[PDB]
Amino acid sequence: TTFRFCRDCNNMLYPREDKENNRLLFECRTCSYVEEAGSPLVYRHELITNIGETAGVVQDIGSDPTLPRSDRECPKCHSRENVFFQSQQRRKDTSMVLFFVCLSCSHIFTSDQK
Amino acid sequence: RYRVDLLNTDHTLDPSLLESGSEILGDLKLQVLLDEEYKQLVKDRKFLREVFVDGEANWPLPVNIRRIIQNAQQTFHIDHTKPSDLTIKDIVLGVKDLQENLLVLRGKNEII
Amino acid sequence: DQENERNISRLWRAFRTVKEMVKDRGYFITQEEVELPLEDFKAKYCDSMGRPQRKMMSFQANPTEESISKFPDMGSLWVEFCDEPSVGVKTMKTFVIHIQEKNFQTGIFVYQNNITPSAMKLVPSIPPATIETFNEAALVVNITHHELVPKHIRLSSDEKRELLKRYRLKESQLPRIQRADPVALYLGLKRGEVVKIIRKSETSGRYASYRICM
Amino acid sequence: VGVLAAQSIGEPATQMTLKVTSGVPRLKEILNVAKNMKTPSLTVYLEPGHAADQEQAKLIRSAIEHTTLKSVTIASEIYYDPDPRSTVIPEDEEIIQLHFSFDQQSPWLLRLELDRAAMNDKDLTMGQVGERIKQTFKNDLFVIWSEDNDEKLIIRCRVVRPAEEDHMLKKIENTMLENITLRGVENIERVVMMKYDRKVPSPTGEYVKEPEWVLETDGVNLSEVMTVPGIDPTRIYTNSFIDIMEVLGIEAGRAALYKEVYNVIASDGSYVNYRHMALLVDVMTTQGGLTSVTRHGFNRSNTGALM
Amino acid sequence: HKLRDQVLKALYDVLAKESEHPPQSILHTAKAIESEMNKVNNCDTNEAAYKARYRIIYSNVISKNNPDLKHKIANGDITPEFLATCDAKDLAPAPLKQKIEEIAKQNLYNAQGATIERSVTDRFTCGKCKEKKVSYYQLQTRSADEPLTTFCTCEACGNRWKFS
Amino acid sequence: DGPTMREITETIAEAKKKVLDVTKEAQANLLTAKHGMTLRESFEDNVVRFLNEARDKAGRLAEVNLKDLNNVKQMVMAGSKGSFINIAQMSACVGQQSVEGKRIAFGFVDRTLPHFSKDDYSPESKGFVENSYLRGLTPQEFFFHAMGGREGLIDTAVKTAETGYIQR
Ligand SMILES: [Mg+2]
Ligand SMILES: [Zn+2]
Ligand SMILES: [Zn+2]
Ligand SMILES: [Zn+2]
């Protein structure tokens, strides 16, 4: 569902149809460059979204003070230090999931109990 | 609480409530009066049960009875021994006389 | 099932509401008749497999002896159930001419759906005969059986005049009621009539009031 | 009496407080109608023949709640399927031979995907929604669908034709999503059912708090909800008394209004006497229609120019 | 009769496609024709519900999941009952069935809504019922010079009153 | 009295324990997800219910301890002034402060007030004034108390003008 731009001039290729061989010609509209696409999927909606709970993992989260600290272990490095915080995707509908990130292994892991 | 029998058994009055209670045990006339009064009462019960559909009994109403009969007792010294000299005919006529002498709408016509 | 059963049951209940319309309007209908069961109704009015035939399902009716005894002037009424979802100008023209020919003064007409104004511009024709219109959707449920609706009854002109002379009003100080009111349309009354209203008060139980249909 | 009633209603409105509207603004709305909702709820009582059948109550809910494709569509995607009688998507072959046991169509597949829970919560098997859109058009759209027994629910549809098809399909599916009713009467939203009770007369002639289930909503409509099956048409009730007045006549209108005003002023600081409230209701309803006390409502009566 | 022979052709195709290729070809086409007559015992090309039930049974045979239904219909599952089943939600297969009841149970749970429950005490008595099941609230309504309102809510009968 | 004070303290402590248990269950993502309500709504309802029960229980405990020679008891059962909640708040516990039903919201991002780490829901962080008017308030609790009082004042200052108009 991503956009492929015309390499010859940076504009996204548009879906247009072979009138006889029946192929997906992503053609440029700016210039005349044409491209054959890979899959018959073109448009895509996703009427229900449920993603974004682990947002903004920067490489140096531990430099902030205001994040709390705990004593669970990273199940890659088993260091007893770690940082946890609430899910990032602030909807009225989200959960109490805690995402633990450890400074040692720089690795994220949750505590789901399904 | 309300049903009285003057010729049957089960709901018969104790005759020591009224000195003329023994001899009237058997009169058809007073029995008829009591029975029609009882029918009037049960019609009232059905009517109230269809107007206050829940069954709430406490309601705002005019002049209180309970204080009046209470101080009637405390004025005229009711006892536990003397049978009353009230007669059944007297009671059931007096209630209807008061029933009509209550007056909110003056007038003379059918609508009023 | 699909929509056939809903159509059958809706028509059945509309017929019930109809019938009790006419009954409390003062025309003489056997008490058993209004609770006629649905399967019996369909047995009376199925043609081939499930289709109801509304054209023959209409009926005439007669004022009661009592309603005549008080009200000296009501002729027979007559009801109608056209089968077209629209309303045909010639169809209602035949209807109103049939009312005129049979010498009827109150003509009950029921439409499936919308009425073109050409087929309803001449509704107020032929006085003193009056024509009344109804949707089945407006008749699928009897309005008066709702418990917030109090009892409504009609006033003769004589006792209305008596009422005015007693309470010393003059004919405009009464509280009003719209012509387009649902209960007003249920009773079918017109301008200048008085409806006595009996509702279940809470400080005296039973309480009287009157309205004017102006 | 009128001034007495007015003061007796006015002063305990001063010491009164400020989901559902209440308090000062609700009193202002119901005293100043203003046919605006902010809580257009209406309580629905079931048929007494269905006392406690939760499945029956849910069935009435599914009959009454308005639903469109938003309620049921999970995923929508578009496709270029060149073959009018075979599928580029591997899975959608059994569906093809089901519907093959009338050719001049664009080779531009539109695909839908639903939730089984969002179908059978409301007892919509997808068979009738497939034939529902089929009878919605019957002229322009092939509509092909799955079985209800599959693990994935898809609707196959193509436009028949006697270039540019991308945005026409976009507009068509937009209309699809928006406007096709499925079941239930419009202006009714998510409906919930509580477990109430009622001091019903006991068969031995007493009173008992016998429970029963009630349907409750968040929208308003009256001309249809009375007409649905399995319902008590008599005891239906709405907060928005203007619609009550319109459907039931102004007697029931003023009764509902009195109920509403008593509810508001008895949420706290009860009670005023009945007769004052009744007088306010009656002077507000004694014109054949509702008459708000505004700068214009009662003011534009045939009344003295000086007052 | 075209619909008759088409349903027969489909039935012969799906039973020949079974893993148990039945050497009793005449017996299985007898099963096919007897399913045809008991199927048309509903409407016999008079209503589209005949086609709908045809779709239901045809795709249930096809589905895989489940495949074992082919052997079960080949070795039993007396089809005059299977005209009158309508009972696709209770077949093909059991795990999907179990999924269906748990879906329905969760839906019924999510239907019924808010049930706030009014925490009580036992100190006051009811203004009407006169029993001690009393529940309250606090907030202050009027101006600052006075305390809270001390709202009351009986639960033996549902009464409301207030204390200053 | 000392022992009653000690019982008050342990009552509030076990209420805090119940709250912490609920928070653990919520953070472990298994909850009943109360019907008609969203997950966080259920969590908030449970915790507010627990805290108010704690306040009521403590206030009842103080009142039933209190001697018959206590004068505020003499007035309060003598009619005129005072209240059960007044006795409870002056001696046992203030209780959870309020800003329209919800407790004190994260005005600062992820926290109520800049003296705590982010993403807490323990009642002292979000505003349960555990303490009592005799002992005085820790300054955070003092601030939340100021919030609740301010809400009451502004509500009065608007309702008076609107009710005057609509009386006229
Ligand atoms: Mg004037
Ligand atoms: Zn280009
Ligand atoms: Zn690690
Ligand atoms: Zn009570």
Side-chain angles (χ1 to χ4, degrees), chain A, chain B, chain C, chain D, chain E residues 1-144 147-164, chain F:
Chain A
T1 186
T2 67
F3 282 165
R4 285 193 285 273
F5 292 86
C6 174
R7 163 210 171 274
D8 300 332
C9 46
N10 264 326
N11 303 113
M12 74 300 298
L13 305 170
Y14 270 32
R16 190 268 300 162
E17 187 46 55
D18 195 294
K19 193 73 109 179
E20 63 276 15
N21 312 108
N22 314 116
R23 274 89 177 270
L24 276 297
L25 279 114
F26 277 167
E27 60 178 18
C28 169
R29 296 293 152 78
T30 293
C31 85
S32 74
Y33 170 63
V34 76
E35 178 54 47
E36 182 65 27
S39 158
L41 182 63
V42 174
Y43 191 83
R44 169 70 270 187
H45 202 295
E46 325 38 13
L47 280 76
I48 294 92
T49 121
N50 52 87
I51 302 299
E53 66 274 15
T54 63
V57 63
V58 67
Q59 278 68 234
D60 48 346
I61 300 170
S63 46
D64 171 88
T66 74
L67 275 297
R69 287 173 158 83
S70 54
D71 306 279
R72 213 176 309 263
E73 61 86 20
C74 53
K76 266 86 194 173
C77 53
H78 316 283
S79 52
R80 271 311 167 177
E81 56 87 18
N82 47 0
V83 167
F84 68 101
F85 50 93
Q86 202 59 261
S87 159
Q88 284 308 310
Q89 190 274 331
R90 300 249 57 93
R91 273 182 298 189
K92 269 270 187 175
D93 92 23
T94 179
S95 163
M96 297 302 92
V97 180
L98 301 187
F99 291 115
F100 286 89
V101 56
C102 169
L103 282 71
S104 80
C105 46
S106 74
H107 162 84
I108 51 161
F109 66 101
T110 186
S111 62
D112 185 75
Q113 272 68 239
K114 278 41 182 222
Chain B
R1 191 169 192 172
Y2 291 116
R3 164 72 155 160
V4 54
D5 284 336
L6 214 51
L7 274 80
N8 216 352
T9 117
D10 51 357
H11 304 117
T12 314
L13 295 190
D14 176 71
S16 86
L17 274 78
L18 155 66
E19 66 265 8
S20 74
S22 55
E23 57 269 57
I24 66 170
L25 195 145
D27 169 48
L28 272 297
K29 164 177 160 78
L30 261 54
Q31 183 59 75
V32 166
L33 284 199
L34 290 175
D35 286 322
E36 59 89 27
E37 184 262 1
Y38 180 71
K39 176 181 146 71
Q40 164 68 254
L41 214 57
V42 70
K43 289 306 268 192
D44 293 323
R45 173 161 157 93
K46 182 160 63 193
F47 168 70
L48 271 296
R49 199 168 282 256
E50 82 180 1
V51 65
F52 286 139
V53 60
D54 45 354
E56 168 54 78
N58 305 313
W59 284 101
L61 273 182
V63 164
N64 175 29
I65 295 92
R66 262 196 39 192
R67 199 179 321 119
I68 299 192
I69 48 172
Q70 272 176 2
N71 58 68
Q73 297 174 314
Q74 277 318 118
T75 300
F76 288 96
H77 319 306
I78 62 170
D79 59 355
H80 50 268
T81 317
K82 289 307 161 293
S84 183
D85 43 351
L86 289 160
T87 65
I88 306 300
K89 180 191 272 271
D90 205 358
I91 282 177
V92 303
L93 70 92
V95 288
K96 281 208 246 190
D97 294 331
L98 178 65
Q99 176 71 43
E100 53 90 11
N101 286 119
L102 266 61
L103 265 186
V104 179
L105 277 297
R106 307 291 195 273
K108 290 307 173 70
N109 57 81
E110 174 59 45
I111 279 177
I112 291 308
Chain C
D1 198 72
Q2 48 82 26
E3 52 86 20
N4 179 33
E5 300 324 290
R6 278 86 69 192
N7 282 258
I8 281 165
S9 163
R10 282 172 67 86
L11 195 67
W12 179 66
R13 295 157 80 209
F15 197 36
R16 277 201 75 256
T17 57
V18 229
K19 204 162 291 310
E20 55 209 355
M21 263 288 87
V22 178
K23 175 177 197 310
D24 47 47
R25 211 174 277 208
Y27 301 78
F28 160 35
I29 286 163
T30 71
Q31 187 40 64
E32 51 87 22
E33 191 175 353
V34 295
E35 68 276 14
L36 189 152
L38 184 143
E39 80 298 337
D40 300 338
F41 167 81
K42 189 60 182 175
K44 202 68 159 290
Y45 304 111
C46 172
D47 43 14
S48 54
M49 69 298 287
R51 313 286 100 195
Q53 62 277 17
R54 303 162 173 137
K55 181 56 189 290
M56 58 69 60
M57 185 301 289
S58 307
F59 70 102
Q60 305 276 357
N62 189 339
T64 82
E65 188 265 352
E66 183 46 62
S67 306
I68 285 303
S69 301
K70 163 176 58 44
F71 288 163
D73 49 352
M74 288 64 64
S76 192
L77 59 90
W78 161 236
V79 307
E80 198 63 37
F81 295 96
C82 276
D83 278 299
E84 44 165 359
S86 168
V87 176
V89 290
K90 216 178 177 72
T91 75
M92 61 79 69
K93 180 251 285 182
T94 55
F95 178 52
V96 64
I97 283 175
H98 173 270
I99 294 152
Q100 191 42 251
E101 286 155 334
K102 293 285 190 179
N103 188 252
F104 292 147
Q105 78 297 333
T106 53
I108 295 90
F109 190 73
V110 176
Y111 44 86
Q112 299 301 136
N113 299 292
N114 63 5
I115 312 98
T116 178
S118 47
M120 61 79 70
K121 45 159 54 67
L122 72 165
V123 175
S125 172
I126 47 156
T130 61
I131 308 301
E132 51 272 22
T133 69
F134 283 121
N135 190 354
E136 305 99 359
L139 274 295
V140 66
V141 170
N142 194 9
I143 298 302
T144 65
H145 283 142
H146 196 304
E147 94 274 22
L148 277 72
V149 174
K151 183 66 68 67
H152 290 83
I153 58 171
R154 206 177 178 199
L155 272 288
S156 72
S157 303
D158 176 83
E159 60 203 10
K160 156 186 161 164
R161 189 267 300 163
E162 175 72 36
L163 177 142
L164 272 296
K165 202 185 195 178
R166 282 323 169 185
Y167 285 172
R168 317 281 264 273
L169 274 77
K170 35 176 201 180
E171 200 50 52
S172 167
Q173 282 153 330
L174 285 171
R176 289 171 170 82
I177 184 168
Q178 295 265 52
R179 163 176 295 149
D181 191 286
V183 71
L185 288 160
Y186 184 79
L187 274 298
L189 73 164
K190 63 195 67 61
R191 173 160 319 276
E193 290 178 82
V194 171
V195 170
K196 180 173 178 182
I197 294 180
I198 295 304
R199 80 190 162 214
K200 308 305 211 270
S201 84
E202 87 176 17
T203 187
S204 311
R206 203 176 75 231
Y207 168 69
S209 76
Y210 314 99
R211 307 267 199 168
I212 191 66
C213 182
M214 200 172 228
Chain D
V1 187
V3 173
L4 201 76
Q7 287 184 346
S8 70
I9 297 179
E11 68 84 24
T14 70
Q15 280 81 247
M16 161 293 298
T17 309
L18 194 153
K19 293 180 175 68
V20 60
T21 74
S22 85
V24 183
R26 170 67 157 157
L27 193 148
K28 165 189 277 189
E29 159 179 330
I30 71 180
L31 187 150
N32 215 26
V33 58
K35 64 178 72 66
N36 268 347
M37 58 79 72
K38 280 276 278 195
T39 311
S41 67
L42 59 89
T43 70
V44 159
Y45 288 87
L46 207 53
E47 175 67 35
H50 316 139
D53 310 344
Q54 297 322 291
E55 72 291 5
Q56 183 69 40
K58 184 200 274 267
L59 188 151
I60 302 305
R61 151 161 198 278
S62 52
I64 198 58
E65 179 171 6
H66 183 257
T67 50
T68 72
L69 269 71
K70 314 315 171 157
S71 64
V72 303
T73 302
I74 292 304
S76 74
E77 281 153 0
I78 210 165
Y79 277 121
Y80 181 75
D81 210 332
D83 198 289
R85 278 139 173 79
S86 300
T87 319
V88 290
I89 295 91
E91 288 85 351
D92 307 342
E93 300 289 335
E94 55 270 23
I95 299 96
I96 282 301
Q97 51 89 51
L98 290 174
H99 281 62
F100 277 80
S101 293
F102 43 85
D103 184 42
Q104 304 322 109
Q105 39 178 283
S106 159
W108 278 58
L109 169 65
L110 194 150
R111 257 282 293 274
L112 294 176
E113 208 275 333
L114 318 172
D115 166 41
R116 296 179 66 89
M119 221 49 222
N120 47 51
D121 54 349
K122 197 177 174 66
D123 291 331
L124 270 296
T125 70
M126 50 67 77
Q128 69 271 17
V129 306
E131 63 87 19
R132 161 89 208 176
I133 178 57
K134 170 60 163 151
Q135 62 89 27
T136 310
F137 289 168
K138 204 70 86 168
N139 52 357
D140 313 316
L141 270 298
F142 272 44
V143 176
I144 295 90
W145 53 91
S146 167
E147 190 183 6
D148 194 77
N149 286 106
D150 290 331
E151 283 85 359
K152 200 173 179 67
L153 262 61
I154 48 167
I155 313 296
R156 192 163 195 95
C157 61
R158 285 169 184 158
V159 59
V160 66
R161 189 260 311 279
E164 214 190 0
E165 310 94 347
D166 186 74
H167 84 97
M168 283 75 75
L169 262 69
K170 277 166 178 172
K171 266 189 268 298
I172 292 301
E173 64 88 35
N174 175 40
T175 318
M176 289 1 349
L177 283 173
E178 293 293 328
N179 312 92
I180 299 306
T181 76
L182 277 300
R183 203 166 65 189
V185 57
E186 202 263 320
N187 306 119
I188 308 300
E189 320 307 307
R190 55 100 173 175
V191 290
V192 289
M193 80 285 277
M194 300 315 78
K195 197 188 188 86
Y196 277 180
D197 62 323
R198 171 177 47 174
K199 286 182 181 288
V200 162
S202 158
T204 48
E206 306 83 359
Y207 274 122
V208 60
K209 316 174 90 77
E210 169 191 8
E212 93 273 26
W213 286 75
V214 288
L215 266 192
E216 209 276 339
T217 181
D218 49 353
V220 61
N221 210 345
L222 258 185
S223 43
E224 303 89 331
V225 299
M226 302 190 61
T227 80
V228 304
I231 201 171
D232 177 277
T234 69
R235 310 155 61 226
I236 205 168
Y237 181 68
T238 301
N239 48 34
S240 295
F241 53 92
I242 172 166
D243 295 329
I244 280 285
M245 183 277 288
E246 195 278 334
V247 186
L248 276 297
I250 76 165
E251 301 319 291
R254 75 155 276 281
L257 189 147
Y258 159 72
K259 183 70 70 68
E260 209 80 16
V261 180
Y262 179 72
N263 190 19
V264 163
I265 209 167
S267 291
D268 61 357
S270 45
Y271 68 100
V272 295
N273 206 338
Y274 161 72
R275 60 195 67 242
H276 298 135
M277 288 188 67
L279 188 139
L280 159 76
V281 171
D282 292 331
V283 66
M284 200 174 52
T285 193
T286 175
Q287 298 305 131
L290 261 50
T291 307
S292 291
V293 293
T294 66
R295 54 147 175 83
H296 61 272
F298 85 107
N299 211 344
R300 293 182 182 272
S301 170
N302 51 3
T303 311
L306 297 168
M307 64 183 73
Chain E
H1 278 290
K2 181 190 282 189
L3 277 80
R4 188 269 303 272
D5 286 292
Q6 273 162 312
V7 168
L8 281 191
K9 275 184 164 186
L11 260 57
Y12 184 78
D13 287 327
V14 299
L15 281 72
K17 274 291 296 296
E18 299 195 356
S19 300
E20 196 269 331
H21 186 279
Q24 52 273 11
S25 292
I26 181 63
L27 188 145
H28 273 61
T29 198
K31 256 195 172 287
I33 63 167
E34 80 207 7
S35 189
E36 155 76 19
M37 282 75 75
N38 67 36
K39 180 74 155 62
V40 303
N41 202 11
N42 192 15
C43 309
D44 191 76
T45 74
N46 296 349
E47 289 172 351
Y50 155 77
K51 311 177 69 180
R53 289 276 297 154
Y54 151 73
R55 293 202 156 277
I56 288 301
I57 62 170
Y58 191 12
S59 176
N60 276 288
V61 176
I62 278 154
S63 53
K64 298 162 175 182
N65 207 4
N66 67 333
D68 64 331
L69 193 140
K70 277 179 147 198
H71 322 88
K72 201 177 180 180
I73 189 71
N75 313 322
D77 309 345
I78 306 102
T79 53
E81 193 264 344
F82 290 88
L83 163 80
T85 57
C86 295
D87 162 23
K89 68 155 295 298
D90 274 304
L91 57 88
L96 183 63
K97 286 165 66 160
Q98 162 261 339
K99 167 89 69 169
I100 285 300
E101 290 87 5
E102 61 88 16
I103 282 300
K105 182 265 290 180
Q106 196 173 2
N107 279 323
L108 196 144
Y109 180 75
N110 301 341
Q112 59 88 28
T115 43
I116 189 70
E117 71 272 15
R118 306 306 167 201
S119 70
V120 298
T121 179
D122 50 348
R123 43 193 64 251
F124 321 126
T125 190
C126 170
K128 329 280 188 159
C129 79
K130 303 165 105 187
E131 274 89 7
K132 293 179 147 207
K133 286 166 184 179
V134 298
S135 54
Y136 65 95
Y137 181 137
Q138 61 90 25
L139 188 139
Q140 56 93 26
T141 293
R142 73 280 191 191
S143 183
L148 309 167
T149 59
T150 77
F151 288 155
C152 311
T153 313
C154 178
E155 316 296 322
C157 63
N159 181 25
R160 187 262 175 188
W161 68 91
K162 190 176 179 180
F163 208 105
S164 189
Chain F
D1 174 33
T4 63
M5 271 275 268
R6 190 253 308 151
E7 285 186 353
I8 288 166
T9 302
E10 64 91 17
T11 300
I12 296 170
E14 68 90 18
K16 288 215 241 191
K17 191 256 292 179
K18 278 166 177 167
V19 166
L20 194 81
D21 177 83
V22 162
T23 56
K24 208 211 183 177
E25 285 295 320
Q27 280 156 322
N29 288 321
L30 73 164
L31 294 175
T32 179
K34 288 187 57 56
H35 49 88
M37 279 177 349
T38 305
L39 206 63
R40 322 177 64 105
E41 310 289 325
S42 313
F43 170 64
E44 287 298 322
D45 169 87
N46 273 344
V47 60
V48 171
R49 180 59 69 112
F50 274 130
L51 276 298
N52 288 320
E53 285 184 355
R55 187 251 312 276
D56 168 87
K57 219 177 296 178
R60 180 176 178 178
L61 210 46
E63 207 270 348
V64 303
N65 164 57
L66 211 52
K67 227 153 185 175
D68 273 12
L69 273 298
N70 196 302
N71 316 133
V72 70
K73 183 171 206 264
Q74 278 206 121
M75 300 184 285
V76 74
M77 62 81 70
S80 74
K81 291 308 257 202
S83 69
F84 173 80
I85 193 80
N86 283 28
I87 282 179
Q89 280 211 300
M90 305 210 4
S91 67
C93 181
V94 169
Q96 163 66 273
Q97 296 300 282
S98 178
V99 173
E100 53 267 16
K102 321 177 179 181
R103 40 185 185 158
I104 296 90
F106 314 95
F108 289 84
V109 55
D110 311 330
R111 38 178 170 158
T112 65
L113 184 63
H115 311 289
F116 321 119
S117 44
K118 293 182 157 293
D119 307 345
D120 196 352
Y121 298 99
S122 73
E124 62 278 40
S125 178
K126 188 169 282 294
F128 175 56
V129 188
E130 53 85 21
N131 199 356
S132 83
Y133 282 172
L134 207 54
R135 312 196 207 174
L137 318 171
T138 77
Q140 307 88 308
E141 291 165 320
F142 173 60
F143 209 60
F144 304 137
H145 195 55
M147 301 285 218
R150 172 78 68 77
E151 179 153 333
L153 271 295
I154 59 175
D155 180 72
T156 296
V158 179
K159 68 185 285 292
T160 181
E162 216 69 16
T163 199
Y165 172 67
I166 128 166
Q167 195 266 352
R168 184 177 188 273

